[PDB]
Write a protein that binds this ligand. Structure first.
Ligand SMILES: CCCCCCCCO[C@@H]1O[C@H](CO)[C@@H](O)[C@H](O)[C@H]1O
Length: 711
């Protein structure tokens, strides 16, 4: 029987073997784990994979929001898929309608097309079930947290059933003042022909969010903080700022809507061969007003020489954006023999249009903020569109073919080839007559504030990616594998932006090549204790090439090289019928092989990347009524990216977070849960910005009481 903590297979038909027989660093976080841990979003559920989280706060004109996930030494936020379909938006993704999350470390261009040199994160959506029931969850937690979720599956006919997922979350912040997060969701689904060779799945998903965004707090007092100048010397002795202090404005807001319609037709030609066709329309809106703080010598105002009077400048970080994705994906999976060789083929054709428009807004001039006693009770107002927007489009036609050749009962070979034919179009304009950062002068006969185009280009290209693996069953319980993969990210692949050919340092330069990630891997997977526990161990090397670097003369070129090398181990499943365990450890060394240093301390290291990361979670069924759980996360020391800012910590120190759980069940319809997070009320640096002026403090000890009603 399969363990609830270790799902046996990926829901993606692109994966022709179970997790154990898959030649990849794959982790499947189930709905069961999320529910026991009290995880309600992607980031929290991703804590189940070591060295995966939002480790970077942003720059000075921009700050990171939502699931700004860093995995394997780089921002992987653009490589977040829902049902094997790209989902782009600096918004938090809720787990109210996801059955499982699939994480793969080590990219492959064959898997989902263009990607970050990290791997893939895939949120698998809830579909209508054969059985009927209702599931409810009411939650009350620390800092006025409230959560209500409903999961209704109802069978209508012999071959038709409906599914409805409802959600409501209204909360405050336990360790941050004025920060409020409100969201709700509806997810209706209808499936026809269940149990037959013909099936139609129709799904809709709507999420509205109204949040108060946080831009962090001053890094004063942290290890490695120095005063920026002799004039501001006092800052070396004044100490750390109160972690609760909110430096934003009472006008700060973060509003986002998510609308995704999906239509899947599945036809079983035979008990071996099946054809699928998925159509999806999706739109992610997001508009926010945020506050970034600056504390260089030129940003510090000294009214009375007493540090309690001293102020830091405020900089508005705005966003008015829409991400639209229209796609059609055809997939065919067949199992057949070619003599003594068994085949497991997965092939398909995908057509996609991705749109990103950043509606320009008027500059928001914010006043200075007191360092130790900030006043956020100010109203500079919301946003006003100025007509000067950025438009990005990407038309993508991909054709793939994957095969797992079962050579013997003990030997397996597997391959894959994909061709992505793309066309990206980019334009961006700025309102003229401005004063500050990148202000364009108004030409003749052009009235003030008029949009003046700065970029208006396009890029077309082909992307040939491939993969290869071999697996050998040592015992009936354990195997040994090898894998190699090619992944590419073309100019305009990262965020639709492009640059005019022959000039800058941009990877998005239309004359530039894509960034290639070559991944070598040797591993071992083992299914023990009646196949109820999965133990894994891999050695990896991800080489990144065609990175942009400056030549001896001012001019730039793609001679740069990076390497993310390491060791991976993982545990998932049941130890005994009452003992459940999920987790792993990673030793990942991410360095610059060729090129300029990116780390602040001039080391060859890559920033916002822990070298060592550990995550363990266990649950024991103490008695028939009492279940007890515990968790432990270690995130290592990380380098801050290089920057002109003086006296800002060049790095953040490592931290250990511990969690606990205890569940009591009354009858078989009602059960209670109590989750305590950050059990030792440990303080730490969750993330730091590029300049190094601001950091996000570690979430303090927080409680969560849940009522679980099942039918
Ligand atoms: C798994 C063992 C259960 C321990 C229950 C919580 C005990 C930790 O308690 C915390 O310890 C910190 C020092 O470590 C103190 O700074 C905090 O004030 C205190 O709340």
């Amino acid at each position: 029987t399969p363990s609830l903590y270790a799902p046996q297979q990926s829901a993606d038909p692109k994966f022709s073997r179970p997790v154990a027989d898959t030649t990849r660093t794959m982790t499947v976080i189930s709905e069961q784990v999320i529910k026991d841990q009290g995880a309600t979003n992607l980031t929290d559920a991703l804590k189940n994979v070591p060295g995966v989280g939002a480790f970077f706060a942003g720059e000075n004109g921009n700050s990171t929001t939502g699931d700004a996930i860093y995995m394997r030494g780089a921002d992987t936020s653009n490589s977040i898929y829902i049902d094997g379909i790209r989902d782009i938006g600096s918004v938090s993704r809720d787990t109210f309608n996801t059955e499982q999350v699939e994480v793969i470390k080590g990219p492959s261009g064959t898997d989902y097309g263009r990607s970050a040199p990290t791997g893939s994160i895939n949120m698998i959506s809830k579909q209508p079930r054969n059985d009927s029931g209702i599931d409810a969850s009411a939650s009350i937690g620390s800092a006025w947290f409230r959560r209500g979720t409903l999961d209704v599956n109802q069978v209508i006919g012999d071959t038709t059933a409906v599914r409805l997922n409802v959600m409501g979350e209204k909360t405050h912040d336990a360790g941050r003042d004025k920060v409020k997060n409100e969201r709700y969701g509806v997810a209706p689904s209808v499936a026809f022909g269940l149990g037959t060779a013909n099936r139609l799945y129709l799904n809709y998903l709507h999420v509205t969010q109204h949040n108060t965004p946080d831009g962090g707090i001053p890094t004063i007092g942290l290890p490695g903080y120095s005063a920026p100048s002799a004039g501001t010397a006092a800052l070396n002795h004044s100490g750390k700022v109160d972690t609760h202090n909110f430096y934003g404005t009472d006008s700060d807001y973060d509003d986002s809507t998510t609308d995704t319609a999906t239509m899947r037709f599945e036809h079983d030609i035979n008990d071996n061969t099946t054809i699928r066709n998925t159509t999806r329309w999706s739109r992610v809106k997001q508009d926010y007003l945020m506050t970034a703080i600056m504390g260089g010598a030129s940003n510090i105002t000294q009214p009375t020489s007493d540090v309690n009077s001293w102020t830091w400048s405020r900089t508005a970080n705005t966003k008015d954006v829409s991400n639209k994705i229209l796609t059609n994906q055809t997939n065919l999976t067949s199992t057949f023999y070619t003599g003594s060789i068994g085949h497991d083929v997965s092939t398909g054709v995908e057509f996609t249009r991705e749109t990103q428009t950043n509606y320009g807004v008027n500059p928001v001039t914010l006043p200075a903020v007191n360092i130790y006693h900030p006043d956020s009770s100010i109203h500079p107002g919301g946003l006003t569109r100025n007509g000067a927007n950025a438009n990005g489009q990407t038309d993508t036609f991909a054709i793939y073919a994957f095969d797992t050749l079962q050579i013997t009962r003990d030997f397996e070979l597997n391959g894959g080839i994909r061709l992505d034919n793309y066309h990206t179009e980019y334009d961006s304009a700025t309102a003229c007559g401005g004063s500050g950062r990148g202000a364009i002068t108004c030409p003749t006969g052009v009235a003030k504030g008029s949009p003046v185009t700065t970029v208006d280009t396009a890029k077309s290209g082909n992307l040939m990616n491939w993969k290869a693996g071999a697996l050998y069953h040592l015992t009936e319980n354990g195997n040994v594998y090898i894998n190699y993969a090619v992944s590419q990210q073309p100019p305009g692949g990262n965020n639709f932006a492009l640059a005019q050919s022959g000039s800058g340092n941009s990877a998005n330069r239309t004359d530039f090549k894509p960034q290639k990630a070559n991944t070598s891997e040797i591993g071992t997977k083992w299914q023990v204790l009646d196949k109820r526990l999965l133990l894994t161990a891999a050695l990896f090397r991800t080489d990144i090439e065609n990175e942009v670097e400056q030549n001896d003369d001012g001019t730039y070129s793609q001679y740069g090289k990076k390497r993310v090398e390491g060791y991976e181990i993982s545990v998932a499943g049941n130890i005994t019928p009452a003992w459940q365990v999920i987790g792993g450890y990673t030793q990942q060394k991410a360095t610059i092989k060729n090129g300029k240093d990116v780390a602040q301390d001039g080391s060859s290291s890559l920033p916002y990347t822990p070298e060592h990361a550990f995550t363990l979670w266990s649950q024991y069924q103490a008695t028939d009524d009492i279940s007890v759980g515990a968790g432990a996360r270690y995130i290592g020391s990380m380098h801050k990216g290089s920057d002109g800012a003086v006296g800002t910590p060049a790095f953040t120190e490592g931290y250990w977070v511990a969690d606990a759980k205890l569940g009591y069940r009354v009858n078989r319809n009602l059960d209670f849960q109590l989750n305590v997070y950050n059990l030792f009320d440990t303080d730490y640096v969750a993330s730091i910005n590029k300049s190094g002026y601001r950091y996000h403090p570690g979430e303090p000890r927080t409680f969560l009481l849940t009522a679980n009603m099942h039918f």
